[PDB]
Amino acid sequence: DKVVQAGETVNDGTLTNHDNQIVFGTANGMTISTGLELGPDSEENTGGQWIQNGGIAGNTTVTTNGRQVVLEGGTASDTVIRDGGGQSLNGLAVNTTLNNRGEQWVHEGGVATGTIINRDGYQSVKSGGLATGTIINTGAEGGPDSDNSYTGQKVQGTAESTTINKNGRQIILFSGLARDTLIYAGGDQSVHGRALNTTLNGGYQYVHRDGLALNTVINEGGWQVVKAGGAAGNTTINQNGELRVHAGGEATAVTQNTGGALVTSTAATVIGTNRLGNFTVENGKADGVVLESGGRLDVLESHSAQNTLVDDGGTLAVSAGGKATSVTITSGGALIADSGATVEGTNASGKFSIDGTSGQASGLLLENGGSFTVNAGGQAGNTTVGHRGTLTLAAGGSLSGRTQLSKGASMVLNGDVVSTGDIVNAGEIRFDNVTFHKLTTTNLTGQGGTINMRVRLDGSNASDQLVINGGQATGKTWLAFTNVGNSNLGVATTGQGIRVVDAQNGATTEEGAFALSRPLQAGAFNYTLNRDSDEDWYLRSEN
Ligand SMILES: [Mg+2]
């Protein structure tokens, strides 16, 4: 048991085999490799280096099993804690570096400045301690879904001037404060206490139940997530940043700049000012919201929205029972709703309305992930489905006027449908749900575009079916059949065949109107699509 007394500099050496070194003067260049054999969580340990009040340790290396205890008024310079060593800090530590399960506990009254947490190292600031000028490079390599709180920085006290690099993680517990942080892309900070003055230069900030975040700026690639029961105030959403406010979250004094994404629901609280004026999402009522660049507003059941602008890259999602009036969707805006929602506004091509009370819609335009669902007994008129838009019809839906499908458009049919107007398909219609449906239209105009249909080639003469009611089938439209019966079994067709397009009440079809997209064989037969004199089209057997 060496005792370095005051003004007696010890200037190299090691420490082993549960031996203590009591420092009252100066002890440079030590190797502490004893005292922590039993693990950080036991008062059963003997050995290590103990810097007393007024003592100094410079360029110590605490390696596996080594324990360095700095008491009140001691100091530890340029310390390397690695490979499962630890430092218990009640005084001053300057320029510590933590590698591979090296730990630093800064207990009440302790102060650590310049700690670099390098990989699988850990700095725990117990309540009443202070960490200043920390660099965190680890803790967050498992992604936003990693629940790792065992490496990185955990604060129960206070952390000032922290830089969080890729893979770095800061957890602020209930009692904790983190003031002035810069969080780069790949790194994150989890806030359960107080985070104040945070710069997300592509970094992530999670604000959980009972966490307060004040003065966060979200630059490009950054993310502020306010969970239920968390609260953020005075956030600035710069271009290509997003603020996420969950049901039960507080977002007050939000500055949504141009290019800023806002993702929230009427079940949260978001007050602020965007590039068009003031906005409020409060108590189930949103007024003035501007969804762009990945922003989403969900108007849940029995809430309301007015003066919403859905711009290119934004999404308005109105649940059934929600209302949203004076909507303006610019070309490239997405609208998700069904015939039980109530929406009014204007889109890229004029006025539109969904009246959830009667279940009739008129003039929709579904682009870029927009979607509408016509529920049972509903009716959508003059629909325009664009690239990446979807129109789904529940069993018992109706169409009215001209249903136009642009290239890249989807229309899914989950049961029998009647259009009392014109379907114009340049995209893809698809009979899905194993029951077979009938799509009745007055006129079909094919502009390319497959209708994906289903067939049983197993002795049934059973299939999906198109019906031209009184009108005409023109253009060119591809038919894609899938055999849903017993495969490798093919039965012969009987007489005229499986009727797939039925012309009725005087309907005519043109002669190159329909065409098999790919061959249809089952078992020993090739199934061929043939138009006859009755204007109807049939599936028949080959050789
Ligand atoms: Mg701990």
Coordinates of C-alpha atoms in Angstrom, one line a residue, residues 444 451 453 455 461 463-468 471-479 481 493-504 507-517 527-540:
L444 CA -65.0 1.1 -70.7
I451 CA -57.6 -5.6 -65.2
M453 CA -59.0 -11.0 -62.8
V455 CA -60.6 -17.8 -62.7
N461 CA -67.1 -22.2 -65.6
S463 CA -64.7 -16.3 -63.0
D464 CA -64.7 -12.6 -62.4
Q465 CA -66.6 -10.8 -65.1
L466 CA -66.9 -7.4 -66.8
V467 CA -70.3 -6.1 -67.8
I468 CA -70.7 -3.4 -70.5
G471 CA -72.6 1.3 -73.8
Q472 CA -69.4 0.4 -75.4
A473 CA -65.9 -1.1 -74.7
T474 CA -63.3 0.6 -76.8
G475 CA -59.5 1.1 -76.9
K476 CA -57.2 -1.6 -75.7
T477 CA -57.3 -3.1 -72.2
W478 CA -55.1 -6.0 -71.0
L479 CA -56.7 -8.9 -69.1
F481 CA -56.1 -14.0 -65.2
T493 CA -64.5 -25.5 -71.5
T494 CA -68.1 -26.2 -72.6
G495 CA -69.6 -24.6 -75.7
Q496 CA -68.9 -21.0 -76.0
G497 CA -66.7 -20.7 -72.8
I498 CA -66.2 -18.9 -69.6
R499 CA -67.8 -15.5 -70.2
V500 CA -65.5 -12.8 -69.0
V501 CA -66.9 -9.6 -70.7
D502 CA -70.7 -9.5 -71.0
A503 CA -72.2 -6.9 -73.4
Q504 CA -75.9 -6.2 -72.5
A507 CA -73.6 -3.0 -75.7
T508 CA -71.0 -3.5 -78.4
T509 CA -67.3 -4.2 -77.8
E510 CA -64.6 -3.5 -80.3
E511 CA -62.5 -6.3 -81.8
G512 CA -59.1 -5.5 -80.3
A513 CA -60.6 -4.3 -77.1
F514 CA -59.3 -7.1 -74.8
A515 CA -56.2 -9.2 -74.8
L516 CA -54.5 -11.7 -72.5
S517 CA -51.5 -10.1 -70.8
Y527 CA -56.9 -21.1 -72.4
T528 CA -57.6 -18.5 -75.1
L529 CA -59.5 -15.3 -75.1
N530 CA -62.0 -15.1 -78.0
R531 CA -64.6 -12.5 -79.0
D532 CA -67.8 -13.8 -80.6
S533 CA -70.7 -12.2 -82.6
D534 CA -72.7 -11.4 -79.4
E535 CA -70.0 -8.8 -78.5
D536 CA -69.1 -10.9 -75.4
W537 CA -65.6 -12.4 -74.7
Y538 CA -64.9 -16.0 -73.6
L539 CA -62.2 -18.2 -72.3
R540 CA -61.9 -21.5 -74.2

